[PDB]
């Protein structure tokens, strides 16, 4: 039996938990769009439900926001590209033995040789907006070595938090208690932007309101622009007019454009009344305020703060990788028990690039000693 | 929130219609439907006894709301 | 054995498998499309956003500003 | 400006990151689709899965020859 | 939220080290360095520090302790 990281023995099954016939029904889902006609009460109810462990409506709302809002998508893409551009290397523990160094370098070489690692990291970046990111693991054989063939992303809406114990995710199976996650078969990465339980640490909680304000303002602005700068044309006719005479007047009113002429009797009158007036200053002011609020929420400014954000979420991702992927590989490949405090980890190249021009000052220091 | 509510009802004056006291019940329905069908470059014919007017339900600027928001921020 | 030439194909002639998303198939007026012929296609997809295929393109976010700009102009 | 922000990321470093990301994706697609079949059809023996060549793009920032004159003192020091 | 996140990221970015008292003995230095190595080797320390940063907005921060054994320690 394979020994867990916590020290509790268990049985390892290569088949996915989602491949079960009974679970096949819940796998197929229709992606509802709760962003149509958003109401502050509706958003508050969705957030309240997500607090208790629903996590479905909030996930769909976050998906809708990440595609409907251009600024939010741009900022998220910028952040994910910034985190993805870093370089990583596997290093063993301090004062490591020769065998430990050999294992560390072989794992490092394998992970640079693994194609699915980049996709796995990119998919794990989804926990910046959503509260969590869940990916399957497809175990396989490569030269008598247990390695993952590929990792499959899963919809965040298919997971619910345990009411008895929060901060623990479970697979939804239409039951009071969801199915426990299959050990050595999942890669769960969560980003704790704010302290608290899972499902409340995502960026959706703070970004729901500016999105609503900005979208409503822009749609109202577009509607106002539609009926702007074209006054309505009206025609007054005497009470004794024939039914046919009204039709001719109605057709004549509809035929006004460019440099138009026309003759009207003394009894009839024609006037122009504007159906909309105002300026675009307030709509644009609100849109700009919402956009800068979103930019402040995501990036921290409208740089050093970007570097700190990258360091923090890179460290969180490294901890998640060490907890989820590094240990099972060694545990399955090695027959003996894996030491808990002597396992290799992943270190990202989080170092500021030096300036070769200003490091010429080291020569006098080297001469002095 | 007050600024958003003000923006909701801004730059679109209310359309009203006056009808004579002798109008039929059906005639009021047609006028009500006609008032609701105003948009873009709209036309229309109105009798001498009836009148149509536009009244703005909200006016002002966004300067005070933004000033208060900036001070609070 | 080398490829003589590569011919681009219309993206509208492909449909995703309802049983298993993220997999493209050639449309043949059937519930399940024809599976791609091995060693006969060059399929490149750009994952701008995580999720299933057909939702990771730039169309999803760029549809709205295009509509607003064109209607305004 | 919204469209420009969506496509290019700004209205530069971000352009470089976008180029690196989509170049890497295209390189992975090329390695998966075109590199393997050529070797598989040309070679009679089975092709090793973990020992096949790939494509690498020249994703390196151009250096400044004026500022690299500082390497001479470092070379002298060791 | 943005300001609180900025402050917490600023405080979290610092580096720490365990040091003994002044004029420490050899055993005191050994204990200090072993505790320092263990705390860098402890994964929960970063999460504990991040959660303890909640006392900037709230008046206090309370966290449980789950004692255990690691090599008879």
Numbering used by the authors:
A (entry chain U): 3 to 304, 322 to 388
B (entry chain T): 221 to 293
C (entry chain V): 148 to 220
D (entry chain V): 294 to 304, 322 to 388
E (entry chain T): 75 to 147
Provide passages from the article that reported this PDB entry.
By employing the symmetry mismatch reconstruction and the local reconstruction methods, the structures of the portal-adaptor and the terminator-tail region of extended Mu were resolved to resolutions of 3.4 Å and 3.5 Å, respectively. The Mu connector complex, which attaches the tail to the icosahedral head, is comprised of three proteins: the portal protein gp29, the adaptor protein gp36, and the tail terminator protein gp37. The connector complex in the majority of myophages and siphophages contains the portal, adaptor (the first head-tail joining protein), stopper (the second head-tail joining protein), and tail terminator protein, but Mu is the rarely reported myophage to possess only the first head-tail joining protein. The Mu portal is constituted of 12 copies of the protein gp29. Each gp29 protein contains four distinct domains: a crown domain, a wing domain, a stem domain, and a clip domain. It is noteworthy that the final 124 residues of the C-terminus in gp29 are absent in our structure, which verifies that its C-terminus may undergo proteolytic cleavage by protease I during head assembly. The Mu adaptor is constituted by 12 copies of the protein gp36, each of which comprises an α-helix domain and an elongated C-arm. The C-arm of Mu gp36, which is absent in the X-ray structure, is inserted into the clip domain of the portal to form an extended four-stranded β-sheet, thereby further stabilizing the interactional interface between the portal and adaptor. The adaptor gp36 exhibits structural similarities to that observed in siphophages and myophages, with their α-helix domains adopting substantial structural similarity, but their C-arms and β-hairpins exhibiting conformational differences, possibly due to the differences in their structural environment. Despite lacking the stopper, the adaptor of Mu, which may assume the stopper function, serves as a docking platform by binding to the tail terminator protein to join the head and tail and prevents the release of the genome.
Myophage Mu is a representative of contractile nanomachines with a simple tail baseplate. It has the capacity to infect a range of intestinal bacteria and has extensive applications in genetic engineering research. Using cryo-EM, we resolved the three-dimensional (3D) structures of the G(+) type phage Mu in both its extended state and urea-induced contracted state, the latter lacking the baseplate, at near-atomic resolutions. The structure of extended Mu can be divided into four distinct regions: the DNA-containing head, the connector complex, the tail, and the baseplate.
